[PDB]
Symmetry: D2
Subunit: 262 residues, 4 copies
């Protein structure tokens, strides 16, 4: 079934995770045909400014994710930044996510693929579609079986990303494909010491992703994006989450008939 | 009323135009909810090589297009390359097309608008979406009342183009928007003394366009794409047009309600 | 001898031309080992806005340029935008300049080549260095003997240009190469209905161009840059020309030894 | 005191570091006004293919490097990929190198800075010149005193990089700037399983860098580049290292009297 990865960008507090996990859970019950996964980073190890919010550490984070997984019975996914976090994080994460900038760090991929968990690699802003093939080969070598590749934009000039949708069918040749609807529209370092974004384009490109054909969508949400401690201009409101989900399912029903073979 | 602009890239002969027109006429009768416009260039004025096919002249081209209009009752569109061509072309063209490399040539835009005919400007590979606002302003200054802006890709590195679908909603603010499904996947000068392309991406990107939201699609076609005298690697088999059109209408039907208001 | 093409961007008035020509003449007398060419456009046919300054017509311009040539004995270059302008322009222009957006327009190149004059083609912002071979081929076919290709930046994301200095040795294989120091640092439609620019990068990049190896430098100048009716954010103050020319001659002198052959 | 960072791409064999360190030593004796620093990676932690050469371990590397430093009395630099490697590597490395893909990894930067050693950050292929200011701020916050920023190209379309020389004067505002002459001409994933490159542009782009103005150059060398275990198509022949160094010194001597003031 279609995959939908949602949740706040960062674990600002397990209280937030629970509030969001609540809505996701509800949606999990309304759309039984969709496989939901709660997502949230315990640490923003790559902020532009040393002064920006990062998180409360792996311990706190893993705990919060457990709470959500136990209280709502939802699958969990979070990203690791160094080889040593794979094993410990793999205790709660159903899917281990590999950060975009780190999509080529061999040891990080192997460590994630040794936990037996599923691994979702964010396609680097510097990588070409056909280049993700080796990324999958590394994971396969590392013992991974459930592998995902996530489209999240490509470097287009300075402080700007463009989504080359030709990547969806190209990467589908060797791995399940996910489209990152929130980071694809962000503007790297667009705010001096922060990365801005253009929310007005999140939904439109999501509709495009589904029409083209992907195995799932990735989208970060938050009660009040304006108050988000990370990626505020790209965080999608919780109240809009349901409507958008209904849209992708409808579009997916009509378009699936036309998706090309692998 | 969705617009479908289709036809052979160039006027290889009056015979080729009548063969493609017969099909477009069939399609116009089958899909009465779609507005069809037959397209074909009387001159490829911007070929990479001095040895490539250009055409049989304006007089011959205008005559061939009038035959199509008279015989099948179809609307006509063709592109101009120098100001003096606007008037004679207007005798038969319902829509005057302005080439991508020339989207900033003031006199050409003005001459086209002065004819009283609708004008469709191919957005230059060097132009940002917001830069098209001045393009529309020039046309209105020139007296144009019906104006279109066509997305046909942007320069991405050498010999490659990317389609930034954020441009559709942006350009929709000042004019009707068309998606050029054939040129958007072409590879500029990719074949040495000629250009290339990737036909496999044509359909999927078209699905993206209608899902995002546009007022029409531009698709070039040929009975035998392989033998086309220009843009061969991009011409769509004439028999595949029907299925494509059906798909766009189905996708547009479900996606239309999600179209964000400008 | 090294080529220095300089002058005010547009023929704002003959007073302006004469004031600039006076300094170029003085520079001509001081730097005998340099071939200076006075440049000025009789019409800005590609402005972003219908409201921007274009010029006072071809006739006024050819006369203003003839005045410069007669009063100062300087060679002349100016650009044409449509085929019919080549002949009248050739009456005074020693070098006919072909605009960047129009570098692929066969008829414009052929018309320029037909005059017997030298032809300088600005490399399109959408063109790859290797694709300029075909441009030279058209010109030669049309009878041109003295051919120049000018580097003026390539599209890099929106509203930005980057200079790929790899283009200098590549294009040198088939033509003499000129480095456009002013337009290479401009920012396409940066200030809305006008192009921006960063004058602080003009000199540094000119140094790079001569170190890599080229046959000349194209640089615009104005008595009061900020008051220029065209390309304001890029013209160099007249008083700065001397210092810059000295530097290029000195850098060239030491680097020429290392220029790669053929 | 111009800085020259040269050496083999990776620690392939002791005999390699010796044959190169020997030449680098001889050169350091010939050009006393230049500060040479021996460089070589003890591990290629981000190769495209899991089947490509990586190294012989951190131990074998730190050891082989100390051999170079003790035997030839040459400063050393190598890059780290994970936090923990900071402390151990710093016991031999005068300058800790931060990989291009990792220039945003806060903890990695903070770790190299705590060691007290000098830090050189390769600018990410996805980073804009002005984005480096936050990088320097992080390092200073971590205790770094001697900080370098290295230009190594920017993503330009797929499988290609371009060097935007405007970056040199831009990064010089907050740190010393180094120009990576070898990786800047490499073609990412250009050969599918491995990256490509165009060695013919190495020298010319080096001349540009010094003409523009930088504090040093980074050059990878090998006795027989074609036989290199990594970056074979970009490594510079060892025997050419001398001619190149002389050339940049001559160009620097003349161009330096024109460097702008930061």
């Amino acid at each position: 079934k279609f995959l939908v990865i949602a949740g706040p960008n960062a674990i600002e507090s397990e209280e937030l995770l629970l509030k969001v996990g609540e809505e996701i859970k509800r949606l999990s019950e309304k759309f039984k045909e969709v496989e939901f996964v709660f997502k949230s980073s315990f640490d923003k190890a790559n902020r532009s400014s040393i002064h920006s919010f990062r998180g409360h550490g792996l311990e706190y984070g893993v705990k919060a994710l457990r709470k959500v997984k136990e209280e709502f019975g939802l699958k969990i996914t979070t990203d690791i930044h160094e080889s040593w976090q794979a094993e410990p994080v793999a205790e709660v994460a159903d899917i281990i996510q590999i950060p975009a900038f780190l999509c080529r760090q061999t040891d990080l991929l192997l460590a994630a693929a040794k936990t037996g968990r599923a691994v979702n690699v964010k396609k680097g802003q510097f990588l070409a579609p056909w280049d993700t093939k080796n990324v999958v080969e590394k994971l396969k070598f590392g013992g991974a079986k459930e592998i995902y590749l996530t489209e999240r934009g490509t470097t287009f000039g300075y402080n700007n990303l463009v989504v080359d949708f030709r990547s969806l069918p190209i990467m589908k040749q060797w791995a399940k494909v996910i489209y990152d609807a929130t980071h694809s529209v962000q503007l790297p370092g667009g705010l001096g010491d922060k990365s801005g974004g253009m929310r007005e384009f999140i939904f439109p490109l999501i509709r495009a992703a589904v029409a083209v054909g992907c195995d799932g969508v990735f989208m970060e949400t938050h009660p009040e994006p304006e108050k988000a401690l990370s990626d505020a201009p790209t965080a999608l409101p919780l109240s809009q989450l349901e409507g958008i989900i209904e849209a992708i399912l409808e579009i997916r029903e009509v378009a699936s008939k036309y998706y090309e073979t692998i």
